[PDB]
Design a binder for this molecule. Sequence first.
Ligand code: HC4
Length: 124
Amino acid sequence: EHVAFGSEDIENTLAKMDDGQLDGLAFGAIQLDGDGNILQYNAAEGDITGRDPKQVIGKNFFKDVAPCTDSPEFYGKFKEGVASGNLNTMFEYTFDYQKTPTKVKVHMKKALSGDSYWVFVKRV
Ligand SMILES: *C(=O)/C=C/c1ccc(O)cc1
């Protein structure tokens, strides 16, 4: 799937993708509901993070899978965007719960579909 991390229209392009198409992206992609529950989780994200894309669906990202992101800098930005109904933020972050500290770039962007939000990840 020919789509770049950070592209302006990413939410329009990713509205059409099934599981298999999301798995063809060059970067990690997670779709969360407004509470942080995982709706979609692609193969590229599992390759970066070691998590099993099949097992994480239905878990809460902030409570269960990713406690290192339960902080004002990540979760706080997420919830502020859910509350406002708009979200488009990029930042760097370190993942160090199950892994050697690993720095990534994160892009969170409200989806087109209802009650859903994207978290995109790539290595830096
Ligand atoms: C810190 O606990 C981060 C965990 C994490 C980041 C991204 C994922 O896709 C899965 C777990």
